[PDB]
Each structure stands twice: as structure tokens, then as C-alpha cells.
Amino acid sequence: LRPPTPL
Amino acid sequence: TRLRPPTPLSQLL
Amino acid sequence: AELMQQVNVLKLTVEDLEKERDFYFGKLRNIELICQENEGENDPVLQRIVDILYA
Amino acid sequence: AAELMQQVNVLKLTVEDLEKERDFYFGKLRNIELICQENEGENDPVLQRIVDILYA
């Protein structure tokens, strides 16, 4: 799964 | 479809 | 003085977050379609997945 | 300019909201992935097809 890019 | 549709970008701004 | 930099920076962040959000949602929609095709199967694992989609 | 400041604050709210939505949909995907991993042994090919979508 492509992890959400951290803010 | 019973998925929660994403709120449109026209809205929230 | 006052800076317009913030607006343009935030706008980029908004478009990038929108992309990610639409990317994940699309997959969910794809999965919903696969489950709808296998409604007659009465598969307990699929049922669990279906509940997560609509939670 | 107050208009610009309002626009900034509005965008901030929007960023928070999109982030929430993004994590909300991703969370579902993650939980689905875990369920598929638990059932790797069983011959239920639809789960592999669900898995292929997750990694697409």
C-alpha cells in the first residue's frame, strides 16, 4: 500500500 | 454505491 | 510586508492531498464493485470487507 | 489584506479536512489488506483480486 505522505 | 463520496473541492473554499 | 506565499504554498498542499484522497477512494470504489459482483457468494470474509467499506 | 488572510485560514481548514478524508479512506484500505493477509491460505481467489487493487 502506498502510505499517505506525511504532512 | 453506499461509499461515503469524497467532499468536492468546489466546497470547503 | 504581508506575504501571498502562504496561499500558494497551501494551494499546492491542497492539490497534493486531494490527489492522495482520490487515489485511495478510487481503490475503495474498485473493491466495492468486486464485492457487488460476488454478492451471491455469501462469503464471510467478503462480508467483513463490505462492512469496512461502509463503516 | 483581510481577504488574503481569510483565504489562508480557509485553505488551512481545507487541508485539515482533506487530510482527515485521506486518512479515513486509507484506514479502510489498510484494514482490508490485513483481512486479506489473514486468509492467504484459503482458496478464495476474489481476495487476491482485492489485493491486486490495493497494490495497483
CA–CA distance, C18 with D51 (Å, rounded to integer):
23
Experimentally determined by: X-ray
Q: In this structure, what C-alpha cell is assigned to residue C29?
A: 470504489
Indicate the resolution in Å. Answer: 2.3
Residue C42, domain CATH = 1.20.5.1430
Do D54 and D29 meet the contact criterion of CB atoms below 8 Å apart? yes
Task: Please give the C-alpha separations between residue C29 and each of C43, D2, D25, in angstroms, as whole numbers.
Answer: 19, 40, 10
Closest CA to C49 of B12, D55, D33, D32: D32
Instruction: Please answer yes or no on whether A1 and D19 come within 8 Å at the CB atom.
Output: no
CA–CA distance, D54 with D48 (Å, rounded to integer):
10
Do C49 and C31 meet the contact criterion of CB atoms below 8 Å apart? yes
Helices (H), chain D: 2-38, 45-54
- What does the DSSP 8-state code read for residue D41? S
Sign of CA dihedral A4, C15, C30, C53: positive
Task: Please give the C-alpha separations between residue C18 and each of C46, D25, D44, in angstroms, as whole numbers.
Answer: 28, 12, 34
What is the number of structural domains in chain C?
1
Question: Which residues in chain D have their CB less than 8 angstroms from residue B5's CB?
Answer: none
Closest CA to D47 of D56, D55, D37: D37
Count chain A–chain C contacts defined by CB atoms under 8 A: 5
Instruction: Please answer yes or no on whether C54 and B2 come within 8 Å at the CB atom.
Output: yes
> Closest residue of D to C22, CA-based?
D22
Domain that holds residue C6: 1-55
